[PDB]
């Protein structure tokens, strides 16, 4: 059940949507696909399923080349956005169409559908038709159809776009329960990073059909591969400060802050392929910004927005000689009037240094939870 | 339920008055043709609206009796029941043929794709509004030439009019295609995932969902074949082979004008209007 | 000869359609073929045969192809006794150069264009206004109004046309006596060509307004209501809303429907053959003609009427009817892609 | 100006969406409407705008009673859920439709549209049509149309509902600056707690068409009036614990946690209309839960779900005798494996008490920021 996309390339006519997507999903990994462009993730999932041809490269479901295998024999079950429920068939027929067509004994069909309905809380409605059901019940019917089919790999689209929040949460809970109950390989496609953060063993970030980074949720949060991933992960975008590198050591890089005092910080960074005097973009997460009293590096500025959310206060301060307003998050309700001057602290350890191309030098600082 | 000024009442009253006047104007012909049916005379002279009820023309059309008025007997003028039977036969056969030949074309044009889809679609659009008329010369020549070879579709027979009515595939193809497009798109992909050959996916999934549109198309084709004058009038030379809209034209003749008999027959042909108004409208959200 | 022609139809339909079921690449063509073959046999073939007849001299004297060998004829097998002369544009030229057919042809062509244009305009106006009034959402009995207004559509066309033919009679008449009783006038519907054309126009409007009403009702349902809410917020009245919100958003999708209605009214053979049968005769026409005769009816007069001589080749006139019709086809196809 | 509502009731035949609601919006106040997915907020906004008849009650804008006045003369501008842009007209005509309808002075109409476009940077696509525009551009065009109309009261029906997160945040800042500039009365309808607490000067929480509580955002967050408002405000649901009152003081009320620990704790609460031995519900927010080391109340429990968002750790703890799982939330990454015992502190100061009827007794602990303005 180890899907092993290797050098997979897709070109819609002349437009190459996907180029050299090297994914290695081991057995029983809840790998999630999240990115800004929804076309790329859905196209990738459909090519994995078999509904779409692969322009070049080889695909490996389990341990067998499954590039040209018809979708029926790939051993994969897909949950569509519309759930693909047949209105004329009942719930039992909807979740046992596969067994009916291939040819299965009535007893086997009954046993499978009863087990799936019992574990999905679907037996009390196993006479009705899709029209006489609710949204959550339709979703459970689709998941039950996949469960009855018993696929090696579970594939799931993103129906949250056309769906509201209550059954979005119901979807999230049901998917979590299915994963913990089964433990089989399952791929999921979403556009919201919160869902990927909450439910994933290996997040795949797709950027215009390119593998931006593949890793654990905390791995992406703590050690982003590039500026795109760093900005994408985390609802408040990480503050980016253009810096000039002064001196590079073997384990750290010294950069000059753009703000007029030209302070220099010896932040811990891989310090590989770094030239003195080059242009680089420093990145510090809003949550990691220390109070001005605790940190040696102090960044003065003028407060613009003081959004108070009760649990936390997001302060948008406009640092002189910096275009961006450095957003700052503090727990509790800090009191600050708009237009006043507020100072924040810069922790050198939590500083992400980004090359001019976009790649990020590895942060030598150890972070708990990354394992 | 937006608040409106006092002018709303005046606008509503004026609109109701205008609509009532327009409805009276449009219903004048139908109400009249109902009124003639009960008139005793057949030359429509005297009381435009007959207070007296006669039913002489109704049973003449029904053939129930002869309505003895004087010593001499008035036989039934024309076999309206025979007209109805022939029209029903031709319409049913034509509708069955149209549905059978249209369902697969609509499925192919709506759900699956092929390199010639675009050009074929423009072709059907081009040839859809080409009327069955303007080819009656070719149809007459073709049926005259085929009379000696295959008589069952030759001249003066129902085979010819049935074959001519089978040319209405184009109009219904687009309707069934529209319904198929309305049906959700992921069903075929899902059925393929469970392992259904595309023929099975069409037959076991898509076909049972098309029953309402197939019935609607059948009803529409039945009505259209019932109410087609030109082709059936050009063909069907014999009196016994007349259908409706072909044997009906004999009622209004300068030699013997029969307003009462024609109106009785027209009102008796009431099933068409109810069937259309009910099923064709299908109480759809307009 | 005709047996080989059936073999030609076989070679075109069964062959080159067996490739459809043989080649596995053409699988959707397996679904396409049933119905495509039906069209090719029931619609395309009559058109091709009509085009072919125009180049022949098929007539009342030449109705048979070659069966006449001994049955009987001054020609000794030069042109006329052959009975299947390929005239080669002689019939097409005879439409124009003969001038005994050209003048009626132009006259009734102008009449057909005027008839279709006026009918389409009146029908669209009536349907639009009726749809807007019916879909007020503040009226009472909207369903009853819809039923009563679409009743003319539901009633079969031939029944209504024959009812109108009976009512508009002048020998006995019903509308004539009603009008005479109200204020003594005898419109002379059938006798006067102008009154006959007026009767045809009003009858066609009566027959056709419900269809455009249904289409306009669908289009109004398509149009959103937030625009009307905003316009009411600014203070727009009913007429201002109709003339600056609905109509600008209505003509853009209405145009292809208007062109289709133009084509349909340009070839409405049944409003005339049943009501006026050709209208007051024209004077000094070799081919039969009438002051009210959409071209389609003219061609019927030349082909099948006994007085017309049954000149099938002349009665084709295919390169006129189908050619303006195909101009309309291209226009409609372009408008749909808009 | 100052829109005031007195006993406004809307009856949809048998059902009554809104019943006896009383609002007092002063001139210049930014008031938001929040609540569940029910259409009560939208119906209220349409009734204020004049697009819906009021069944009973009185509506006052300024001094005139506009219960039966058409929306044109109410002096109220509204942007709809859809942006209500006429496709056939250009941007200038879209934002000057009302001026064209009313006045015939081309000079003043172009002056107004130019000023509004300049203050909304809409000058560059002035000649474009709404189809060519993006979502944010359509939102700005609708705002510009409202500004050109120049109403006394601005109405907004979920304007930030057809945009992605970044655009929603940016246009939220835009609406904030718009209010800061004009200072005219503005009314907003939304489902987003973040938007409500960021924009509104006063927040109205509607429950099935009933005004549960009206007040400042921080006031609602710190001192909810009832269980509904308390549960609604805050992105995570507040933990609710059934309790039994043991003794009542002049300003403190003891409760008994339903645990074999049998612990009793004093909580600073109104202590009015409270009966000894009454089944009530304690409420403490997940944010205010303290680590077990620095709190004398300790709630030992088994960890069910650990969600590591990266910037905070949400730990769902199943207290043995409590039905609903306790939700905790410590900033940063807190390494705790599932199925392991955990203990959290319960600070008595930050606790809310709710009686069986649903109403809440006000806390006596002074919270910072409750009176910033």
XYZ file of C-alpha atoms in Angstrom, chain A residues 2-358:
357
model
C 3.080 2.206 -0.400
C 2.300 4.607 -3.234
C 5.655 5.719 -4.636
C 5.198 8.458 -7.257
C 8.603 8.745 -8.938
C 9.423 11.469 -11.493
C 5.730 11.896 -12.332
C 5.100 14.648 -14.894
C 1.736 15.857 -16.213
C 1.238 18.316 -19.080
C -2.247 19.561 -19.950
C -1.663 19.907 -23.674
C 1.410 22.136 -23.604
C 0.965 23.521 -20.065
C 3.011 21.303 -17.739
C 0.912 21.265 -14.567
C 3.088 18.721 -12.733
C 6.829 18.205 -13.217
C 8.921 15.546 -11.447
C 6.715 14.938 -8.404
C 8.809 12.541 -6.307
C 6.600 11.354 -3.434
C 7.353 8.390 -1.162
C 4.338 7.443 0.969
C 5.005 4.466 3.230
C 2.339 2.038 4.415
C -0.302 3.468 6.730
C 0.642 7.141 6.365
C -2.114 9.773 6.336
C -0.452 11.971 3.724
C -2.250 15.258 3.045
C -1.995 17.443 -0.062
C -2.314 21.168 0.659
C -1.574 24.105 -1.622
C -2.912 27.389 -2.991
C -3.858 26.079 -6.454
C -6.588 23.464 -6.113
C -6.217 22.209 -9.683
C -2.784 20.688 -9.069
C -3.695 18.663 -5.981
C -6.926 17.292 -7.450
C -5.161 16.434 -10.710
C -2.411 14.636 -8.783
C -4.955 12.640 -6.787
C -6.876 11.698 -9.934
C -3.670 10.579 -11.669
C -2.894 8.432 -8.623
C -6.405 6.962 -8.758
C -6.207 6.227 -12.490
C -8.904 8.561 -13.844
C -6.135 10.590 -15.533
C -3.251 9.414 -17.698
C 0.354 10.068 -16.679
C 2.359 11.927 -19.321
C 5.751 10.642 -18.163
C 7.280 8.839 -15.209
C 6.257 5.742 -13.299
C 3.745 5.220 -10.490
C 4.003 2.402 -7.931
C 0.969 1.389 -5.893
C 2.327 -1.035 -3.330
C 5.224 -2.672 -5.175
C 3.800 -3.038 -8.703
C 4.032 -0.626 -11.622
C 0.485 0.741 -11.873
C 0.909 3.493 -14.469
C -1.242 1.899 -17.190
C -3.343 -0.367 -14.961
C -7.072 0.376 -15.284
C -8.532 2.226 -12.286
C -10.523 -0.798 -11.098
C -7.440 -2.963 -10.502
C -5.321 -0.242 -8.862
C -6.827 -1.168 -5.488
C -7.712 2.433 -4.606
C -10.938 3.950 -3.322
C -11.730 7.610 -3.968
C -14.185 9.892 -2.167
C -15.445 12.527 -4.588
C -16.493 16.097 -3.831
C -20.108 15.261 -4.702
C -19.628 11.810 -3.082
C -20.873 10.306 -6.376
C -24.058 8.817 -4.931
C -26.375 7.031 -7.345
C -29.890 8.446 -6.779
C -31.730 5.388 -8.117
C -29.846 2.899 -5.944
C -30.508 2.608 -2.220
C -27.830 3.086 0.437
C -26.951 -0.618 0.511
C -26.776 -0.740 -3.285
C -24.682 2.441 -3.303
C -22.156 0.921 -0.886
C -22.198 -2.508 -2.545
C -22.216 -1.653 -6.283
C -18.629 -2.873 -6.544
C -19.397 -6.241 -4.985
C -22.571 -6.579 -7.066
C -20.850 -5.914 -10.396
C -17.795 -8.125 -9.899
C -20.046 -10.931 -8.674
C -20.316 -11.662 -4.955
C -22.529 -13.873 -2.814
C -25.573 -12.218 -1.261
C -24.412 -13.335 2.192
C -20.986 -11.738 1.699
C -22.559 -8.498 0.461
C -24.901 -8.468 3.466
C -22.130 -9.139 5.982
C -19.834 -6.450 4.575
C -22.541 -3.793 4.304
C -23.818 -4.564 7.810
C -20.347 -4.313 9.348
C -19.652 -1.024 7.575
C -23.051 0.449 8.453
C -22.640 -0.551 12.101
C -19.168 0.974 12.383
C -20.294 4.117 10.507
C -23.677 4.444 12.290
C -25.469 3.871 9.002
C -27.772 0.888 9.638
C -30.859 2.876 10.647
C -30.990 4.498 7.190
C -29.918 1.506 5.074
C -33.136 1.402 3.037
C -33.335 5.019 1.900
C -32.070 6.805 -1.207
C -29.466 9.616 -1.357
C -32.161 12.272 -1.777
C -33.795 11.346 1.555
C -30.506 11.773 3.468
C -28.583 14.668 5.001
C -25.129 15.886 4.037
C -23.355 14.053 6.829
C -25.260 10.874 6.037
C -24.291 11.180 2.362
C -20.647 11.591 3.374
C -20.864 8.537 5.620
C -22.444 6.642 2.713
C -19.508 7.527 0.454
C -16.937 6.568 3.091
C -18.865 3.351 3.692
C -18.796 2.556 -0.018
C -15.022 2.912 0.049
C -14.792 0.817 3.228
C -16.880 -1.978 1.690
C -14.678 -1.859 -1.406
C -11.722 -2.300 1.001
C -9.016 -0.490 -0.990
C -5.295 -0.607 -0.373
C -5.146 3.209 -0.545
C -7.914 5.624 0.475
C -8.182 8.737 -1.695
C -10.176 11.797 -0.652
C -10.976 14.965 -2.589
C -11.739 18.356 -1.059
C -15.512 18.783 -0.607
C -15.031 21.499 2.031
C -15.232 24.152 -0.708
C -18.939 23.486 -1.332
C -19.657 22.518 2.290
C -20.407 24.525 5.436
C -18.576 24.536 8.753
C -20.689 22.113 10.811
C -20.365 19.192 8.429
C -16.804 20.314 7.709
C -16.091 19.509 11.359
C -18.112 16.309 10.988
C -15.915 15.414 7.994
C -12.757 16.079 10.005
C -13.940 13.961 12.941
C -15.071 11.088 10.709
C -11.782 11.052 8.792
C -9.802 11.049 12.042
C -11.879 8.172 13.414
C -11.472 6.187 10.192
C -7.699 6.696 10.229
C -7.316 5.655 13.865
C -9.604 2.647 13.373
C -8.012 1.307 10.171
C -4.408 2.489 9.953
C -4.296 1.951 6.184
C -2.593 4.250 3.701
C -4.833 7.202 2.870
C -4.215 10.390 0.886
C -6.221 13.554 1.484
C -6.490 16.801 -0.490
C -7.254 20.150 1.136
C -6.684 23.870 0.695
C -6.720 24.838 4.401
C -3.469 24.462 6.328
C -5.264 24.099 9.679
C -6.720 20.745 8.617
C -3.298 19.552 7.446
C -1.734 20.681 10.727
C -4.393 18.853 12.747
C -4.520 15.576 10.761
C -1.371 14.440 8.982
C 1.621 12.156 9.289
C 3.386 13.636 6.239
C 2.245 16.935 4.710
C 3.017 17.559 1.034
C 3.061 21.227 0.003
C 2.296 21.760 -3.688
C 3.296 25.009 -5.424
C 1.943 25.233 -8.988
C 2.374 21.483 -9.313
C 5.805 21.393 -7.666
C 6.883 19.604 -4.486
C 7.730 22.586 -2.287
C 8.492 20.402 0.744
C 7.499 17.022 2.172
C 7.645 16.407 5.905
C 5.829 16.254 9.202
C 3.577 19.157 10.265
C 5.937 20.344 13.000
C 8.856 19.801 10.618
C 7.279 22.208 8.130
C 6.355 24.690 10.860
C 9.812 24.737 12.460
C 12.148 24.212 9.470
C 10.539 25.503 6.263
C 12.355 24.541 3.083
C 11.729 27.837 1.291
C 9.954 31.179 1.524
C 6.769 29.824 -0.058
C 6.361 27.082 2.554
C 7.339 29.448 5.364
C 4.685 31.964 4.344
C 2.062 29.299 3.681
C 2.350 27.508 7.032
C 0.812 29.542 9.847
C -2.253 31.762 9.564
C -0.376 34.996 10.453
C 2.249 35.340 7.737
C 5.788 35.292 9.088
C 7.416 38.721 9.112
C 10.105 39.064 6.439
C 12.879 41.615 6.991
C 15.388 42.240 4.171
C 18.883 42.018 5.642
C 22.474 42.432 4.475
C 24.908 39.715 5.545
C 28.131 41.074 7.054
C 30.214 38.055 8.101
C 29.632 34.307 7.830
C 31.013 31.783 10.315
C 31.054 27.986 10.100
C 27.816 27.623 12.097
C 26.186 31.074 12.035
C 25.611 34.082 9.788
C 25.872 37.732 10.841
C 23.399 40.054 9.112
C 22.682 43.779 9.297
C 19.167 44.889 10.157
C 17.671 47.354 7.645
C 16.528 49.666 10.469
C 18.777 52.699 10.803
C 20.922 51.584 13.773
C 22.302 48.765 11.559
C 22.382 46.256 14.405
C 24.156 42.959 13.719
C 22.901 39.594 14.989
C 24.813 36.296 15.057
C 21.796 34.107 14.394
C 22.382 30.321 14.211
C 22.096 29.243 10.566
C 23.626 26.514 8.394
C 25.904 29.167 6.830
C 26.448 27.211 3.612
C 26.707 28.945 0.230
C 26.725 32.371 1.896
C 28.695 35.324 0.519
C 29.474 38.383 2.630
C 27.621 41.495 1.519
C 24.892 39.565 -0.303
C 21.158 40.245 -0.110
C 19.009 37.999 2.069
C 15.566 37.996 3.684
C 15.308 37.380 7.425
C 12.156 35.744 8.740
C 10.807 35.671 12.301
C 7.436 34.211 13.243
C 4.948 36.636 14.851
C 4.420 34.323 17.826
C 8.157 34.042 18.529
C 8.703 37.814 18.815
C 9.820 38.347 22.405
C 8.809 41.373 24.489
C 11.221 44.283 24.221
C 12.259 43.966 27.873
C 13.552 40.396 27.605
C 15.486 40.381 24.306
C 18.699 42.284 23.623
C 17.653 43.080 20.043
C 14.947 45.759 20.204
C 12.944 46.852 17.150
C 11.152 50.155 17.691
C 8.153 51.133 15.601
C 4.816 52.910 15.439
C 1.658 50.939 16.207
C -0.922 50.848 13.408
C -3.543 48.218 14.354
C -4.150 46.839 17.852
C -6.641 44.033 17.104
C -7.620 42.447 20.423
C -9.093 38.937 20.282
C -9.401 38.323 24.024
C -7.020 35.377 24.179
C -4.346 37.217 22.176
C -3.651 40.714 20.862
C -2.213 41.125 17.361
C -0.254 44.385 17.121
C 0.713 45.667 13.668
C 3.687 47.974 14.257
C 5.272 49.831 11.337
C 9.037 49.767 11.862
C 10.833 52.778 10.327
C 12.849 51.931 7.198
C 10.790 48.735 6.793
C 7.878 48.562 4.350
C 6.029 45.749 6.116
C 4.189 46.161 9.411
C 5.701 43.604 11.788
C 2.723 41.800 13.304
C 3.212 40.803 16.943
C 1.152 38.338 18.987
C 1.046 38.332 22.804
C -1.194 36.252 25.120
C -3.739 38.113 27.338
C -4.936 41.673 26.524
C -1.963 44.064 26.118
C -3.189 47.700 26.195
C -1.822 49.880 23.326
C -3.351 52.908 21.523
C -3.153 53.229 17.748
C -0.407 55.562 16.576
C 1.757 55.101 19.673
C 5.300 53.705 19.705
C 5.901 50.107 20.784
C 9.098 48.064 20.862
C 9.504 44.316 20.364
C 12.330 41.854 20.899
C 13.999 39.747 18.223
C 15.133 36.261 19.305
C 18.150 35.288 17.185
C 17.497 31.561 17.656
C 13.988 31.710 16.152
C 15.207 33.612 13.070
C 14.690 31.980 9.666
C 17.248 33.122 7.091
C 16.218 32.932 3.434
C 18.469 33.100 0.391
C 17.810 35.534 -2.442
C 16.408 32.760 -4.651
C 13.927 31.574 -2.025
